[PDB]
Structures are given as C-alpha cells and as structure tokens.
C-alpha cells in the first residue's frame, strides 16, 4: 500500500487531498501512469514533464522505487518565497 | 549554532527577529532578507511536515558550505495580502561574504525545493502563480 | 527613490531602521547587512564632509547598476566597544537578486572608498587596524 | 595655496590635523615629496606606495594636478565597515 497526497492544481483537478492505494508499483512513474489512466480528470491532473514528486517527504525523480508504506506526493513546480 | 525555522500563518517582525540573530559577539556579520507580496488576496498552500523538513535541510546544506552562526528562516502560509511580508531569512557569520552568500543560497533553494504554492485572487477567479526557470538557474549555480 | 545616509557616534537599531526601508509595497525584496565589532575600545576616525560625500557616491553608483528603491547606509564614529554595531546597509528592489547584489556592492565599496580608520586599544597601547587586499578584490570584481 | 589635511597614522606622525601651505605644486606627488623632505617624522608619515590621497574630497591618483584653493588630504588605506 502507498498513501498518495496531492497539492495545488493537482489537488484541485483530482478532487481530493489524499488517497491510499492498496497496490504495488515499481516506481513513482509506474504509479503516476496507473493513476492518470483512471479518467480524463486524472490524466489532466497527472500530466507533464514539469510535474514534481516526493517520496517520504524528499523530492525525487520519477524513476524512484516505491515500497509498501511509502508516502508519495504529486504537485506542481513550487512557487514559495 | 542554533537554527530557528517557523512555518505558520502569523505575521513576523524583523524588529523582533533581529535581536536574537545578532546576540552573539563572535558573529561580526548579520544579513537579512525579507520577501513581501507586491485588494486581491494571495493564499500560500504548503505540504505539512515536508515543508519544515525541506527548510531544515536547506539550512543544513548552507552550513556545510559556509561557517554560519545563528540562522532564522520564517515562511508564512494561509491568506496574505499585498504588502504582507511572506518570508524572512537571517544568517550570521564571522565575515560578510559568507553571510551574503548563504542568505542568497537559502532563498534560491527555498524557491526551488520548499513545497509551497501561491494562488492569487483576481476579479474573475483564482490563478496559480507560475514558477520561473530563472529560479532554477539561480539555485543550480551554487 | 529616497536615500538615507547617517554618519555619527549614536547607536542605531535595525528594528527602528527596517520599517522605513520596507514601507513601499512596490519593493518586494528587502536586504539588510549589519557589521559589528567582534574590554578594548575601538575608535573610528573619519574625514568630516568627504565621508558623507563618499557614501552618497557609492549609493549613486549602486543605483546606476541596479533598479533600487529605498536605501539606508549608517556608519558610526567615535569610541565603540566589542559587540557594538558599527555599520548598517539596507537596500530594496522589486526582486531579490538586485537587493542582495547591491547590498554587497555597497559594503565592498564602503570598505575600500569611505574614509574611515579603526584604532584598537590592547593592553600595551593603541594599534591601527590593517586593511586587506581581499577587500580590494571584492570591490574591483563588480 | 593648498590646505592639507591628515588622518590616522599620518596625522599622529606629522603631529597636526591640518596645515595651509602657501606654495604651488603641479601634482599631489610633488606636494608629497616636498612635505616629506621637511624632516624625519615627515618622511615617515608620507612614505609609501600604500598611502592614499584626496583632492577636494575625491580619492585621486598621485599624478592628479593641484591648483590654488584645493583641499588635499593624505591618509592610510581605509579600514571602515
């Protein structure tokens, strides 16, 4: 199982803050592809070579491996400061 | 030396933050940066937990590159208004070049690595602020 | 925009100086630098008239290189003690890189072009502080 | 006439803040040489390729021309900030 969090535009488009997905994926990208394929709104939300990801609260490339218990977050380029 | 990291909606005052930063006689140089919002509310969304962790990691890396004394990083969240101060970075060092360099480094990294997102208000609806490639360049140069 | 230049023996407070600097909403970035003395009194001699003129000229040149809003430069004279704040530079700009750059430029030039001389106290007599070639390098790089 | 001011170590060694010299010199360096040649303490004070000069409150090279009415200052490398 992997707990998936969303922020900003990604959150608005998917319509939820978080979801717990009880399935195994090898990488962040594999998870992204399977989530995006649910429906049109999901594909819109998880589209892009700009999209960012964090695993266990560390920014990470999309080839980063996933295991049971990880926290994964998808979000747009940051705009703080 | 000590590090202060604060993420919250409450306003800060440079006049309140400066004395703690400047307390130590061994730190001859003190650099501060304040970033402000330049009618339409801005809201700052963040990732609870990761935001504080990210900020702590940025200061950690700055301490590896420069001999720093006290450091303070404050970033506000929630709804803010034009003119509100959004971010404060304070750094001390024995000498001025380390304080200036580290202060700018911390901001460059905060702008590219800290999970914050700005949404603006405008007459006909909300608009998410766009990130800038120039900030990626500013960060990677270090 | 307005420039404040002060040369005098009286102490300054960043908490007093910051609000004026930060007043304008159009200036999204505010950078400050404070330099301090790190038992033995230090005295700061200066050239009356030329000192104020020099400081004004440095800020003038900074304004030619960067789009600056409000600027404040304060430098103390007379007898000072370890821990005393000796110098303050505050700069504002629309964006952070101009404020950081100009703030450091002003200090680099102040250290090489402003007529001030430091004499220290030490047990067995007074000793004039030696200037550093590294400050000449810091100034000429700009 | 030229009004000559001294600061820091230069001032301490010459034993005065200022002096008005009623004579013409072509350059700062010419003035410096003639002042230095007065006595041992003057030569000590106005020695060096580090020594700085200002004419009318502007830093200046030692080949800078002088005229009647100028204010000239001799002083060590600055150590403010």
Curated annotation (Swiss-Prot), chains A, D:
Gene3D superfamilies: 3.10.20.30. The modification Glycyl adenylate is found at residue 81. GO terms for biological process: Mo-molybdopterin cofactor biosynthetic process. Keywords: Isopeptide bond, Molybdenum cofactor biosynthesis, Nucleotide-binding, Phosphoprotein. There is a cross-link at residue 81 (Glycyl lysine isopeptide (Gly-Lys) (interchain with K-119 in MoaE)). GO terms for cellular component: cytosol; molybdopterin adenylyltransferase complex; molybdopterin synthase complex. This is Molybdopterin synthase sulfur carrier subunit. The lineage of its organism: Bacteria, Pseudomonadati, Pseudomonadota, Gammaproteobacteria, Enterobacterales.
From Swiss-Prot, chains B, C:
CDD domains: MoaE. Induction: By anaerobiosis, repressed by the molybdenum cofactor. SUPFAM superfamilies: Molybdopterin synthase subunit MoaE. There is a cross-link at residue 111 (Glycyl lysine isopeptide (Lys-Gly) (interchain with G-Cter in MoaD)). Keywords: Isopeptide bond, Molybdenum cofactor biosynthesis, Transferase. Changing residue 120 to K: 17-fold lower activity than wild-type. It catalyses: 2 [molybdopterin-synthase sulfur-carrier protein]-C-terminal-Gly-aminoethanethioate + cyclic pyranopterin phosphate + H2O = molybdopterin + 2 [molybdopterin-synthase sulfur-carrier protein]-C-terminal Gly-Gly + 2 H(+). The keyword Transport does not apply. GO terms for molecular function: molybdopterin synthase activity; protein homodimerization activity. GO terms for biological process: Mo-molybdopterin cofactor biosynthetic process. It is an enzyme of class 2 (transferase). Pathway: Cofactor biosynthesis; molybdopterin biosynthesis. GO terms for cellular component: cytosol; molybdopterin synthase complex. Changing residue 118 to A: 58-fold lower activity than wild-type. Accumulates large quantities of reaction intermediate. Its EC number is 2.8.1.12. Substrate binds at residues 36-38, 95-96, 111, 118-120. Heterotetramer of 2 MoaD subunits and 2 MoaE subunits. Also stable as homodimer. The enzyme changes between these two forms during catalysis. Belongs to the MoaE family. The cross-link is not seen in all structures of the MoaE-MoaD complex. Converts molybdopterin precursor Z to molybdopterin. This requires the incorporation of two sulfur atoms into precursor Z to generate a dithiolene group. The sulfur is provided by MoaD. This is Molybdopterin synthase catalytic subunit. It comes from Escherichia coli (strain K12).
